[PDB]
């Protein structure tokens, strides 16, 4: 029993974190086999921030300009290449702690663990969801760039996020490990703002199923809804559309609890109308949308 | 920017988790140096659980009765002993992944990271506070006994919690690594309930400071109070008394903010009657009390 934002054990990723320095700029890199991945803005300077030409900046660098440190060991850079917004530094030694891993690009609504790091040294681990507006709501200070997000279903680490920047509203933007940004963001200091965010409806429903699994039914009701009528109401609260895909994905949790998906949708409609009237659900006084259906199944059974 | 509940990186502890099997019972052990620590109820059968005689159950057992698995490697037990509610299994090999560590006993209101494990394999990590009623609000299923809680200071792991049981209300109870229970609980399958919980006042204030540091300021006001007046309202709402040591600990945040504790208690005083009813601080509709002042400083400074 209990239900918590539960991160993956971070050890497999801790052994991959290194420090990358160019001039006065130091951030984190990810050391997998004989490659170190880091944000390409490690090669910018102060006057480079608004409109850096990364191709022109990189061509002027020699390998010895990159100082890569793994704990106390200095890693020798023997080559480099830029892929989208990620720099790939070939180093002269393969990381002996490299886990089984893959790179995946996730969709909005998916969750992952963030290993926040400074100077190549991990400081904390926590869960994040990719918001519908392609930001994440993390906790990052200066020097955290190059921290990564990952899942570890099975014993394979799936890297899905590398942290690049904090936007004006305090939320965070980054890339996949192929260097493609999530969302419309670019790695330069020009004015950028996240779009209006919305609530991840399928995740709220998954969390309500988690509440039922854990023994709480107070928010259910005797009503059902059509998928169309549910979406018409939920969008008035800035909720994301619920698709037939989402309804299919919730099938297993519906089966375990005996509550049809569209019956849980009717519960959510009433919760948006009424609020919680002094009650909580799984310890929260708001509707939680950063647990996926997969997360609920991972944690509840 | 941002403020999140963050656990310590768990790698130093992952390398210490093993599986301990006694008959049909399998749970998790902590392998440090050449000893494996686990809950003593691993030696009970279902019928023993109702009213166990642990020193008699332990007398009946021998080294060969304990099956200890580290990954795919079997560890040989060469000795066994009990310390309070923890079993100590001497093995023939020192864990080469043993971190610098010590055993500590934490105080209510203090936080730690939990590494939830099943069959000796780490499964998830999250932060917990030791509640005033000596429970923790974790997330644990059958097979999680022997999972541990810990803090990290530089390179030294301070182990503070070993998981033993889930109470009827769904909250969790355990021991320190010397086998002493937190709270008025016993390791027997019997009706037990934690006392009425209370809210950790100094942590709520710490979290209000975190909210200010992050631009959330609508709860600030011009007023101030004193301990006696606040503690009087704290009592009414089931909040822990606020001591002078608490005010001292929040000193740094009062400075770096311009809000005096009793000024903030006046803020908190106000929130306790009028309240939330929907509105939010740091994205929460309720007053969060599982962040310590150091959690706030540690996180809002990059340590
Ligand atoms: C849209 C407006 C923001 O524009 C950009 C654009 C770009 Cl390309 C980078 C950055 C940025 C750089 C650094 C950084 C610089 N120099 C270093 O030595 N180490 C660093 O880490 C850090 N953080 C940051 C701060 C707090 C939390 N998370 C990330 C950043 O956002 C911001």
Swiss-Prot record, chain B:
Reactions catalysed according to its record: TSAVLQ-|-SGFRK-NH2 and SGVTFQ-|-GKFKK the two peptides corresponding to the two self-cleavage sites of the SARS 3C-like proteinase are the two most reactive peptide substrates. The enzyme exhibits a strong preference for substrates containing Gln at P1 position and Leu at P2 position
Activity control summary: Inhibited by pyridone-containing alpha-ketoamides compounds 13a and 13b. In turn, alpha-ketoamide 13b (tert-butyl (1-((S)-1-(((S)-4-(benzylamino)-3,4-dioxo-1-((S)-2-oxopyrrolidin-3-yl)butan-2-yl)amino)-3-cyclopropyl-1-oxopropan-2-yl)-2-oxo-1,2-dihydropyridin-3-yl)carbamate) inhibits SARS-CoV-2 replication in human lung cells. Inhibited ex vivo by michael acceptor inhibitor N3. Inhibited ex vivo by compound 11a and 11b.
Effect of residue 90 to R: In strain: Beta/B.1.351
Active-site residues, record numbering mapped to chain: 41, 145
Residues of the Peptidase C30 domain: 1-303
Crosslinked positions (Glycyl lysine isopeptide (Lys-Gly) (interchain with G-Cter in ubiquitin)): 5, 90
Effect of residue 189 to A: Does not affect ability to cleave and inactivate human TRMT1
Resulting phenotype, residue 145 to A: Complete loss of 3C-like proteinase nsp5 cleavage
Stretches of the chain found on the membrane's Cytoplasmic side: 1-303
Subcellular location: Host cytoplasm; Host Golgi apparatus; Host nucleus
Signal peptide positions on this chain: none
Top-level taxon: Viruses
Function: Cleaves the C-terminus of replicase polyprotein at 11 sites. Recognizes substrates containing the core sequence [ILMVF]-Q-|-[SGACN]. Cleaves and inactivates human TRMT1, preventing tRNA guanine(26)-dimethylation of tRNAs. May cleave human NLRP1 in lung epithelial cells, thereby activating the NLRP1 inflammasome pathway. May cleave human GSDMD, triggering alternative GSDME-mediated epithelial cell death upon activation of the NLRP1 inflammasome, which may enhance the release interleukins 1B, 6, 16 and 18. Also able to bind an ADP-ribose-1''-phosphate (ADRP).
Subunit structure: 3CL-PRO exists as monomer and homodimer. Only the homodimer shows catalytic activity. Interacts with host FBXO22; this interaction promotes the proteasomal degradation of nsp5.
Protein's name according to its UniProt entry: 3C-like proteinase nsp5
The organism of origin for this protein: Severe acute respiratory syndrome coronavirus 2
Organism placement in taxonomy: Viruses, Riboviria, Orthornavirae, Pisuviricota, Pisoniviricetes
Gene: rep
Complete-protein stretch covered: 3264 to 3566 of 7096
């Amino acid at each position: 029993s209990g239900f918590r934002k539960m991160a993956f054990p971070s050890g497999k990723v801790e052994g991959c974190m290194v420090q990358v320095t160019c001039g006065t700029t130091t951030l984190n890199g990810l050391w997998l086999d004989d490659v170190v991945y880091c944000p390409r803005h490690v090669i910018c300077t102060s006057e480079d921030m608004l409109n850096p030409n990364y191709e022109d900046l990189l061509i002027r660098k020699s390998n010895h300009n990159f100082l890569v440190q793994a704990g106390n060991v200095q890693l020798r850079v023997i080559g480099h290449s830029m892929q989208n917004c990620v720099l790939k530094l070939k180093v002269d030694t393969a990381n002996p702690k490299t886990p089984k891993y893959k790179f995946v690009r996730i969709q909005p609504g998916q969750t992952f663990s963030v290993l926040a790091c400074y100077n190549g040294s991990p400081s904390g681990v926590y869960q994040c969801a990719m918001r519908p507006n392609f930001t994440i709501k993390g906790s990052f200070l200066n020097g955290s760039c190059g921290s990564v997000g990952f899942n570890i279903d099975y014993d394979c680490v799936s890297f899905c996020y590398m942290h690049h920047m904090e936007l004006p509203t305090g939320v965070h933007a980054g890339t996949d490990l192929e260097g493609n940004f999530y969302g419309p963001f670019v790695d330069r200091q020009t004015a950028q703002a996240a779009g209006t965010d919305t609530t991840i409806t399928v995740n709220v429903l998954a969390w309500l199923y988690a509440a039922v699994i854990n023994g709480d039914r107070w928010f259910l009701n005797r009503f059902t809804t059509t998928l169309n009528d549910f979406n018409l109401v939920a969008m008035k609260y800035n909720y994301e559309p619920l698709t037939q895909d989402h309804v299919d994905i919730l099938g297993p949790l519906s089966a375990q609890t005996g509550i049809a998906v569209l019956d849980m949708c009717a519960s959510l409609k009433e919760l948006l109308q009424n609020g919680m009237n002094g009650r909580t659900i799984l310890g929260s006084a708001l509707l939680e949308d950063e647990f996926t259906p997969f997360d609920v199944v991972r944690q509840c059974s």
